[PDB]
Amino acid sequence: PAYRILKPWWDVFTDYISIVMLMIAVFGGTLQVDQDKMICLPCKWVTKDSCNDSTGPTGIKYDLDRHQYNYVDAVCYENRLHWFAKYFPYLVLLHTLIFLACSNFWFKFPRTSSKLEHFVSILLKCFDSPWTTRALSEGVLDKKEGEQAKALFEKVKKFRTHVEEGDIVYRLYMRQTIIKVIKFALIICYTVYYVHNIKFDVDCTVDIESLTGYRTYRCAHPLATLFKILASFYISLVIFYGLICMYTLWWMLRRSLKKYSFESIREESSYSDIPDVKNDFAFMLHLIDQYDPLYSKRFAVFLSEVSENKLRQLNLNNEWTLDKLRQRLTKNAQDKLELHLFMLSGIPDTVFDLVELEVLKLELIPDVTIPPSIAQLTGLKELWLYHTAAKIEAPALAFLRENLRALHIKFTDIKEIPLWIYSLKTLEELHLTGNLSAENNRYIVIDGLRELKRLKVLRLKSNLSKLPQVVTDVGVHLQKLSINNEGTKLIVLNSLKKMVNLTELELIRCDLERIPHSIFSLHNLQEIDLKDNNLKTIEEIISFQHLHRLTCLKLWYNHIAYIPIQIGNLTNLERLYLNRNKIEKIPTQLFYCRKLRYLDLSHNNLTFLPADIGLLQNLQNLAVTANRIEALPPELFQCRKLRALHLGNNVLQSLPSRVGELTNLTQIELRGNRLECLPVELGECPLLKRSGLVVEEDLFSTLPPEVKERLWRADKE
């Protein structure tokens, strides 16, 4: 049935020859069972046990009964008739049974039968698959059809590992063919030698003279000529069977069937990655070629991994649809429409169809080739290639050079960094993450930064020990340089004096423990955040007064244990974020900077909060969370511009009613502390609401019911 594909012309020929030979066996067997007799007539005159062969003719009277004649027939049939004439049909039937068993042994042996059935199934359902037609012919595919196509691909993938290792089917077919050919040789020897013994006239000399009276009888075998022509027909059929088996043996010898080359298939078709198959898989593929080569032509489609990549791309273009991706679109801190592609095989075309995209996140996309359809991403300005090597061509390169402006490349290898990122004209923001210190590549791969003249932001989370000179030549046009070294001292040597255009030097985790002179040598820095620079004593702040541009000096995450009075020189400061430190106290002279608008002192060791806070009339958010302030001074409430009061987790005994003076206060952190009760004057603040007033439920319930209702109504609306 299903194995007709695996039976070539020689197998069909041998099967039909075996059927005809079995018919001969059955016919001869029935004849030899029913009508096989031996009519024997005694010789009247004998000479030394041999018939002498010595007025109308009269019959010879033998004086023998019918039963004596039957006895003579039985004795001479048993004794003198040759064994070949008696057992020709049974020997023929035995030979046909042996031939049929040899031909069908590999269809019944479970070890080869399992492989044969698996091969037949995964080649036939391969044959009727539509993916074969679509691939050999070379947008949208049916969901069931695509799932089936990938299922048969995986099934072929496991079948190749399950069969190619072994050669049991090939060896079994070899052994069956060899046994059949030697059986044919034995038959065509013995049958031809003994076929001449099927004679009509047989002399019998059986010595039954004491029971019959005669010794020699001239018998006659009736089915001798018919058995002779049956034997001749059987010999002819065995000759044909043997010639066919020798052709099969010669076919198996000349061409190595333990190898199969798809060279003809891979040249006619575009797919040239079809591998050369070997062993049993090669053998049954050769058999299928003997049946019909176009079956293997279609079967070679699933053997090429280029077809796998095409099918995976098409299925990804279907699995990720434009609709689901419209929901996938989110927004970042910069309020930019963005989609995060995590573990994707490539970029779906549905992703590139999107035109409102601002930030495309190619994160962990294995070796994806960027197609020119990125030109559809007209709004595309931000690409974050996170461990994603981007393969690109000329039109997509031109579109990115003319459109793309910010590029945050995160890599773990030099090869992960693409070389085309240095050819973009409009790039202005560039972020690197990953160690850059290497042999014969230290600050040489980025030598293409000179081509990039629009670069303004250069973040290097590269654990680098020194700033590269190419970045120093770039710094003529660079306005922002943030270095992250993760606790590695960067060798300054006052080498940052070249970047006179630098505006925001954010040394993140640089572990400098000192301020080099290059920080206050350049005149263009407004914001200098020495995050985790581990500066013990903040002593270089006198020279920062020449920095008229400096308005944001964030000295957080340091061992500053005391603030010298000298900071009173710097009157231009606004966003002094001095949090997460061990400041024993901020002094009165610290409040000499009346321009301070944003002041962060959270997670500090303050003794208290002084009165000169009344000087800072521009203060908006004062943050002393988890510091040591026992009582809130009224001078804190003297200022009216407070907006975000991070006062939680403190030892504030009580909040004075003077908070009712505050109107700009839209949020105040009051959770924890030693707060006895919340004053009713908190309801006087218009901008404050429930989300703004974060406090424990019981302390909030200490307020009168109606003012709480007012706050609730102002909150929900």
Next chain:
Amino acid sequence: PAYRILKPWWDVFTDYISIVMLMIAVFGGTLQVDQDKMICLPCKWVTKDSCNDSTGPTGIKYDLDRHQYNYVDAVCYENRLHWFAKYFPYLVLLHTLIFLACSNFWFKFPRTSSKLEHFVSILLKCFDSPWTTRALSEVLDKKEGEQAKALFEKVKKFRTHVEEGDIVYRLYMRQTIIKVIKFALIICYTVYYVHNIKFDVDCTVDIESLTGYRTYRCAHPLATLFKILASFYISLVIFYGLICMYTLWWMLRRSLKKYSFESIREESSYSDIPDVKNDFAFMLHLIDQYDPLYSKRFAVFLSEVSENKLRQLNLNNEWTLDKLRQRLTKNAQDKLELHLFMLSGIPDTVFDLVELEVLKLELIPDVTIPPSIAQLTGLKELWLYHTAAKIEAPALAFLRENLRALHIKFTDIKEIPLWIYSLKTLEELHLTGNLSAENNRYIVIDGLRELKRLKVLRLKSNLSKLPQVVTDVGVHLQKLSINNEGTKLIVLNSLKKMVNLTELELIRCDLERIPHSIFSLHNLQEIDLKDNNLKTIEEIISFQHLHRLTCLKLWYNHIAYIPIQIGNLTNLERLYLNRNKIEKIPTQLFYCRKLRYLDLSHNNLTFLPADIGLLQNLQNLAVTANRIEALPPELFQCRKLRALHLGNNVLQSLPSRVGELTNLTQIELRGNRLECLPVELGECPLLKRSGLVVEEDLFSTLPPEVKERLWRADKE
């Protein structure tokens, strides 16, 4: 099973005759095996090995036992009965098996069996395909279109794999010849030996030593029955001959390896059905022999016109209105444009969407614009690029009252359409492609005379001479543009006839000699002479004849000096003269006060002339890439400097007079060699970076509040 459609009447008849022959073979075989005996009686009167054949009658005593009689029977049956009378049923069985093997070796040989199975599967799938019914009719579902396209590719691949050789036809021929030869041999030998099946047979076997008699006469009881069988068999073989012989004639009267679809292509709509050959032709001939409808409706899957119709229908369903609405963009005039790029046909869904205005169909072949475009409301532009358009008459009527502009790109006469002239209410007829073809010197455009509403006609076709038909048609023209892209036009002063013309343009004609027929026309307001490479314009003393020109456009020329007379035209409002070879330009050029747009980029001028200071109505200038280091106080006598182009230049000094110009719209200053940039770029919300692209090398040393204004430009 499924091979009945491949078995004609001769094959069925031969199969049934073989069945009957097998039946008589089995019957005769059972008779011969069981009841075939030979009753032999001795001839007591022997006369030279012959039966002499010579008082109540009494039976003759032969003195023979029953076993002697059986021995005589066996010997005279073995030796003296004819071999035909003994082996007639076995020979008939062998012949029937040979005939059956010849008939079924077609379906048992794996190559031809696979080919026939593949053909049967494909033809049955096409028979049950619904599109063929529609193909015989002339909606469709997405699934039906998908499966019909897949069946089209399957049919193409099957034709490619089968039409290569004729193994099936050769096998059928060989089987037919073998059957005919077997019939001939069977008839000859059976007719010759049928007379040997006789009832009474005389046997002389020489068993006198065992029996006592020499000659015996035997009766073969079954012989007559075998004779009645044998003649019957002969009759069947006779039939099996003639039918088979007819097959041979049917296989030799006409070449079965060439199937002609002439009848099907002439009855059905599709007349492009190709004539298949070899095995395909043979199986299609056999299938016609079964039923012509199978091949008739299989012919639609071989015709390319059916594939084109199927692809058009699939484009109708594939291109949804939702996807089309995504493809609609907006052009310069804020008008909704659809860019149809590399579509094999034109979707009816394109004409479904009424929001379209500009229909750009580019390199779209086999175009037959359906009048469903009448349902489209906003269509005033249709952009035919490299397209052989064939519109319908109701669509002709609709576009005669609705379409208002038309751009045509083509390759000579091949893609020029004919319906464009029948539309006589259009305004804009833009022609692209080489109209300067061989042997068709302005004879195709001879049908433009009937157009009386045409007022805008842009001619960019590398014309050699002005067509006389254009002179005839122009009487109702208003706008004309001439682009030759590197060819010297032969005008020959034929513009004196055509007086109504308001706008005339001449781009890159390489003339150097401005013609005289312009001065007879007093209606030209906009004259464009870009890249004409003038060097001494003694024509603007002759342009004083023309008092209608409002803006001269002489930019990207090589003017050595501009002659002073143009200073007398106060109506001049636009001085486009950038990228020139100007060494010195005297003053009296600039006597005109009311010039708005000027461009002087990429020159060699050492100082901008003083009497530009007389120009008080400026909007744009340029000092790009030259040898000017300062802005003169004469330029400061002007008060309307909005735009400039001073980039990649050597300007050093920036006084407060130019800097206080708040309305500075777009001045190129990138790459300029300034010394320092002033703090006057700080406060005001009008003059900022997206307006003024000042030098970014000194924009770094500019104060951060200046940078605040400029980055505010990039935001606001």
